[PDB]
Paper text:
The inner membrane protein DsbB, in concert with its cofactor ubiquinone, interacts with reduced DsbA to oxidize the active site cysteines and convert DsbA to its functionally competent disulfide form.
Structural superposition of these six independent copies yielded a root mean square deviation (RMSD) < 0.45 Å for 176 Cα atoms between residues Gly6 - Val181. The cysteine residues (Cys30 and Cys33) are present in the reduced state in the crystal structure. The side chain variations do not influence the surface accessibility of the hydrophobic groove, which was calculated to be 371 ± 32 Å2 by CastP across the 6 molecules. Moreover, the hydrophobic nature of the groove is unaffected by the side chain conformational variability as indicated by the proportion of carbon atoms lining this groove (69 ± 3 %). The overall conformation of the NMR structure of oxidized KpDsbA is similar to that of the crystal structure of reduced KpDsbA. For example, superposition of molecule A in the crystal structure of reduced KpDsbA with the first structure in the NMR ensemble of oxidized KpDsbA, yields an RMSD of 1.09 Å over 169 Cα atoms. As expected, the redox properties, surface characteristics and binding properties of KpDsbA are similar to those of EcDsbA suggesting that inhibitors developed against EcDsbA are likely to also be effective against other members of this DsbA subclass. By contrast, the six molecules in the asymmetric unit of KpDsbA crystal structure is far from ideal for rapid fragment-screening, but is nevertheless advantageous for follow up analysis.
Residue numbers in the entry: 0 to 187
Write the structure that this text describes.
Amino acid sequence: NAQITDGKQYITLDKPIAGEPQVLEFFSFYCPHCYQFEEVLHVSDNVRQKLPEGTKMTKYHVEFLGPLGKDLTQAWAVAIALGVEDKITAPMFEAVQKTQTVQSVADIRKVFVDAGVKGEDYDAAWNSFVVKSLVAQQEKAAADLQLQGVPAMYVNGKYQLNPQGMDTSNMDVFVAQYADTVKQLVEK
């Protein structure tokens, strides 16, 4: 059956925020731990797979890491606005961290284009009011929730996941524990 505990597998915010997405992840394409999180452990997908139906997995990008943090945050806004997150996430992590072929803003676009995204759509999205507000929203969320680092996950703007208090002696275990903790938090 299982049961989680405040202070252990999660922590409760002293200043919860209303109106946030139910399951909100922060990440950076630059961060090695975010790479492991997303591309090796596939934490988020495991979480999403245990999520009570009707509940969506939301991910925001952060600007405070790396030389292109701001522009990658805007590119992620485009990915959201175009609905191409699933086509882009793996290529970008590889291009940024592994092949290290993302050195400029133009190189970001190439990842989208190479991934199947029409350049005309990318360009339209990039300069849209829509994307401009998505950027603002990503920035605002991290501030409101008092983000200290990535990766990070918050549930109902009230609980923060705390992997340090999980069992990290085995990764298959840890992932299952992370997924279940989120599930329990959303049913709460």
